[PDB]
């Protein structure tokens, strides 16, 4: 196989990002020993029970299986002497994640520009739900720059196929501003859950990420002088009264529709990647 990629023929780079039990690393893959080799993203386990294992196999087995356009690229495996030696080697998106990208080029990123990426990441969660995978880290951290005009979902750490007869699970960290009401409250996860944090990325989107303007940021200023409430408890109430996240300046009046729809109370409510999709496609083309 292509895919087996060599243990010993890795060398270790940089650090591309990283959680509790895991890290993704840029590195050079090296089988002529010159420094030449091709330079890949390679995921491996610290802090690592039985759980996270079977977890990052599971990763491995959706990631492999994907062949999206708008979806991070599997490369193949690697694996070594521990027992925590497994590792997920993926291409290398030198320009980074689409947040810092957001930042750094606001004053050159017009409207159809996010109507662009907003109708690619809409695809690639269309993908998934087609293969009945519900991705659970949906945000624009975690979204990475292939180019300017194109970009791709990555990190699968937490995704999770569907049964064949049920269109939610349940699990017994979550990035909260993110999660819908069910499953931060009830750990409901489904296609609909992604949906409500896709609604979080438009939001992302079109405030071009800026930090004063964050769901955190947004939330610290929604709480009213109780600050010394948990988050969590305040979130929820605060989204069963409706409240929800402000229209950007930036954001078409449409797009802040398909927002609020993303955030419809009930999960059976909140349209499907596939009713959003030709929508977003439709901004998006009309505004070239
Ligand atoms: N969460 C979070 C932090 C967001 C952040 C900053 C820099 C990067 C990043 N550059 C990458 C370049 N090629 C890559 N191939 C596969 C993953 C990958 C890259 N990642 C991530 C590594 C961690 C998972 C999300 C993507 O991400
Ligand atoms: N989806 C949504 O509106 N979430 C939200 C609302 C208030 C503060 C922070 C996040």
Redesign the pocket.
Known sequence: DPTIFEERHLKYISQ????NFG??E?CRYDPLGDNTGAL??V?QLQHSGPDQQRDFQREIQILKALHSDFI?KYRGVSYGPGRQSLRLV????????L??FLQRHRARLDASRLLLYSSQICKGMEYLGSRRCVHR?L?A????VESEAHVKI??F?LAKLLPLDKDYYVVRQSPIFWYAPESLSDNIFSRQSDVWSFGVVLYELFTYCDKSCSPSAEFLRMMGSERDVPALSRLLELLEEGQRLPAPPACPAEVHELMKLCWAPSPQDRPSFSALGPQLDMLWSGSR
Do not use: F
């Not at 591309?16 to 959680?19: A, E, N, Q, R, V």
């Not at 993926?90 to 994640?97: A, Q, V």
């Not at 951290?141 to 990475?144: D, E, G, K, T, Y």
């Open positions: 591309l990002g990283k959680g890290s993704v840029l890949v993203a995921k991070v993926m291409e290398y998106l030198p320009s980074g994640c947040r810092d880290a945000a951290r975690n979204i990475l990555a990190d750490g």
